[PDB]
Amino acid sequence: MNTNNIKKYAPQARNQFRDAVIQKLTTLGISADKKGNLQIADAELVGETMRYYPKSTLTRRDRLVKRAREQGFDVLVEHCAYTWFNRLCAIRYMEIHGYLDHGFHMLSHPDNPTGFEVLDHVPEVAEALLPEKKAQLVEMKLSGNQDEAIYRELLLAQCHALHRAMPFLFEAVDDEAELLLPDNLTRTDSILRGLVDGIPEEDWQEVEVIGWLYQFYISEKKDAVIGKVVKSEDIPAATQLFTPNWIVQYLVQNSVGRQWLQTYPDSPLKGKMDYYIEPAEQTPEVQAQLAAITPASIEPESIKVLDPACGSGHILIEVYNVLKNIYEERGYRARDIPQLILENNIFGLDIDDRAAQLSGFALLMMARQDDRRIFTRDVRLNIVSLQESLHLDIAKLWQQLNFHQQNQTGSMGAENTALAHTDSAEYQLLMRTLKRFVNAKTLGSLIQVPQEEEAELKAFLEALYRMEQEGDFQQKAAAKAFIPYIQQAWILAQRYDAVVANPPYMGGKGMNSELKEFAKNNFPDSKADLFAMFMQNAFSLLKENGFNAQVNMQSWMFLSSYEALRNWLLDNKTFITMAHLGARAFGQISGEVVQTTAWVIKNQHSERYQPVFFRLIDGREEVKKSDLLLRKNIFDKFTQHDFKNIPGMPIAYWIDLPSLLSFRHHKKLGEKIALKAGMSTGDNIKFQRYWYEVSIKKTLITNKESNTKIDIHNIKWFPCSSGGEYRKWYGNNEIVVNWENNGYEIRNFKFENGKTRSAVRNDEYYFREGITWSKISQGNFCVRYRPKGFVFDDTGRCGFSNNKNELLYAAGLMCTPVVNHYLSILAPTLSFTSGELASVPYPEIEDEIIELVTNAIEIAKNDWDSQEQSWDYVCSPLLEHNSTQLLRNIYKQKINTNIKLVETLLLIENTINNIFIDKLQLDKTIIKAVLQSEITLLCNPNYRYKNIQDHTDLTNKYYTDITIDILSYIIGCMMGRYSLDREGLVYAHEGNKGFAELVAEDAYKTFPADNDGILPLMDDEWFDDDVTSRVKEFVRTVWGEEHLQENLEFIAESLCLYAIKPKKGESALDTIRRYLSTQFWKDHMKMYKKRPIYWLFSSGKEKAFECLVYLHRYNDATLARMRTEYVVPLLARYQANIDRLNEQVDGASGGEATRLKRERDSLSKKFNELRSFDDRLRHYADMRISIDLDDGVKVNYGKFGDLLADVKAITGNAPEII
Ligand SMILES: C[S@@+](CC[C@H](N)C(=O)[O-])C[C@H]1O[C@@H](n2cnc3c(N)ncnc32)[C@H](O)[C@@H]1O
């Protein structure tokens, strides 16, 4: 069958049917305004008509006004449009299979694509349906022009004809419902055509279509009610799916068919059950147990099955099929089985009056596929939809009932007449029943009813059937009103051999006010979501040896918020079989939003029982099915007693055995170590910084050059562990938080009313030595060491211990694939909090691992401290070897050192993993050894460039970041941030203050530092303090005028590698200059994560003047000096050559004069752009803008409007063009 047709039609069909009811209700007068307030205006009385229509069609009219005032105008239309659609859908299905007694098609015409067969056989069709109006209808057909009048009469006559067998869908007292039937049913634009035209006939063969009609009708109102709280009337929309047939079979066959096969093991139904999971080999003790409960025989018509949420009845249809083959096998006549199944075996509930309308239809269409006279028998269907009790005239009906026959009939009977036999066990049983179904359109089948009231209700019910059949008008009007409630109560008091359902799914963030309190007070173990309450309630609906079988979300197997429930299941019930599906089990939902599992749980507790699991998480819907059938991916080694060894007690069949026997033999991790969540500052943008953004004087960072005692009164910034990226031993020392005055600002940080926004937690553990981890990590789990002088927030959780060895032995553990083996178990998410991480095992201490971890952390710390983004940065790693050697040879010397360390840490990490795996007695096959690509070091090209698979292009890209990093360090020495003479960071505080002292102290005597802190970054050599100029002065001052040219050609060779595009004949010197003016800005953006310490003042898009400015060295007089000594003298040289280039264009010709014009044209564009960058720099230079370094980089960079480059990529806001 092709759903793609129904999926497109049914949503459109819903709304279609709805406007046709509004348009007919507007005539009917029942109407609401835009605000949902109802309007009557009563009804005109033009003699014997009600103009807006007959006046016998008034009373009936005045019962819509009644019901609409009882529910909701929106509701009315949403229901009645559905009922008719369900009716017409029921007719369409039934006319294709020729189920009609008159044997003519009703909605279509076989030999005419546009017509209606009931129109040409008016005499025959009328003879069957309306024998009295035959002379009239044969007269209107002979008028040939009243077909819409005629067809409106036969079609209404057909639905009436179907009320005898299907009273739940085709009601007969629907009087008002006839006034809402649309006209023009006989036109090419009737609503009817889409129902026929949108669905080919082959889609109608099988019955599942009923469920796809079901699922796509309401699909649209679903997309409007998701994410929000769901109204009591929107529930059927928001929770309505459709189970694949292969899951239902697995559910029905492993519950119903299980019990039958449990008594008659050599039943040929086992071959007829493809999804029947055979029982695993039990211990002799359980083997004695199960035989003691299985009855020696089961009679077929003693089995009773319940779907509490049938929906389309898709599950009942399969129960019907499983029961069908049980009756055949027992020796029962063919025709007699449907009645016995639908009356003695199949019972179903739901809240959507219109979902039952389809479900019962579906069972009757399966029954009509087997017995032609099931439509002649009084077949009571136990498929009912739940009804509220806020609209009953209870005192009016119990006196209309005359159950004990109190009114001797005939005594014409007063507004104070004491309700007689209010003490009768039919009244007290009736009132207790009407009190249980108050908000039935909200609770559904979760309402329990005591089994003790079973007998009294059925005897009351059958009597309510009798008196519906033998009684007078009041007793038949009355006893017809009470049956829906006495029946639905009778279904709830009854217990069943198997409950099969695909329950509804709704987390505790769409439940409405009414529903929530019902969960806290009645289902505390499973108050989180609906599907769980159905799981725990369904057990209250089974016999002792009964089977609960559902297909549920998987979260009840893991989330600690179900621990009380998971604890409850293991103690009282017996898991039988479970097929864990995971995602994409339903081939018609989109997104990884739905993860499921189907299971069967006996209502008896057996300890030593051996259940069978199927891990079918992979593939589309088709695959799990194929692997389920082929019995791929089977687990049958763990009893339900074994799953109690895991903190929280997760259903965790995927576990093996030595990992289960290690939770019991060893001690918990977060027990030993104080897993503490950090503060929550409330605002990470106000309080947290990158350490390079602020003055090093104003940080708790102990510099290698400030022996002056850190005055803890001037200290504003303290290094803060704030989450970050994966890392296995030490990095991420990048965030500093504002902790001045012991956090006076974070502590008093309040909202508007007075409540406190931040959440300073565990501030006793601050500045301690400990570890840390990304609380949130996409990949594996990893921890890093954390020295003293740090704080930490909630994004960077930290464990602490008093023993440094345990602090390392833990840090060595929490980084293995072994830990990521457990964290899969306790909580398969990306959240690595302090609660599941605390339940991790943790064995005795070995002294070997503590050295391997000390070596590993210093390998990792040496790795981290090597970049200029770290505070502990000393100098560029090239400057560790002799300064006579050739530069290309020093590159080679450094790479070989960087591969040995990867192997060492890899051999260390794998030695650590292999030691833990030996102690916990684990399986090295499950825990793979660490690979070189996972060694979390920045010198490992495999890890830094995960995306590049090559070796050459991997090696080249490595040489390339190596050549850029040495350029940003030289640009660093130009500004004054580092120095050859002095180890470590040199100058980094506000206002260019104290820089000059350093110069007088020969802080930069080897390589001089730029005077003003303005470096022109240009593509041709104008100034002498140009960047590309001083770089050569650097290489010359370091490696030798001897080597200058090959070291420079090798730099040219290496920039060209990945950084920029080479050019033939381009000197080493030109090659370098090109990079700096164009690409360096971007790499420095990336290098500092869009937080530049060197600011590129840019004239504009012609790159007429670009200069770098070091952030710390900035003062008021800079933009005045920037204009005095750079922007002013440069606009003078541009002119003395536009004039010299015009002395040559007139003195040249041919190919050279066209070359001097493009050199004069290009030079004049850079003269107008730097003329308006001067008109705009003079603007910002007068302002004497003086910065504050504590403010941040995203703020100051907007203070200059568009003078700087990438103002909208750094600040976010487009540059404010002053
Ligand atoms: C049961 S599943 C759909 C049934 C479908 N035949 C299948 O294969 O699963 C979702 C349906 O459950 C229905 N349902 C039944 N009983 C319910 C209850 N007590 N509360 C809410 N929804 C309920 C909802 O109306 C919704 O349409």
Numbering used by the authors: 1 to 52, 57 to 417, 421 to 1225
Structure paper excerpt:
Following crystallisation and data collection, an Alphafold model of PglX was used as a search model for molecular replacement, assisting the solution and refinement of the crystallographic structure of Salmonella PglX bound to S-adenosyl-L-methionine (SAM), a co-factor for methylation. The crystal structure contains two copies of PglX in the asymmetric unit, the smallest repeating unit of the crystal. However, the arrangement of the two copies allows only weak interactions that are likely formed due to interactions within the crystal rather than being biologically significant. The architecture of PglX presents two distinct domains, N-terminal and C-terminal, linked by a central short hinge region (residues 654–659).
Bacteriophage Exclusion (BREX) systems recognise and methylate 6 bp non-palindromic motifs within the host genome, and prevent replication of non-methylated phage DNA that encodes these same motifs. The PglX N-terminal domain encodes the methyltransferase, whereas the C-terminal domain is for motif recognition. As a result, the PglX structure, and lack of nuclease motifs and potential aligned catalytic residues, supports PglX acting as a methyltransferase only, and not acting as a restriction enzyme.
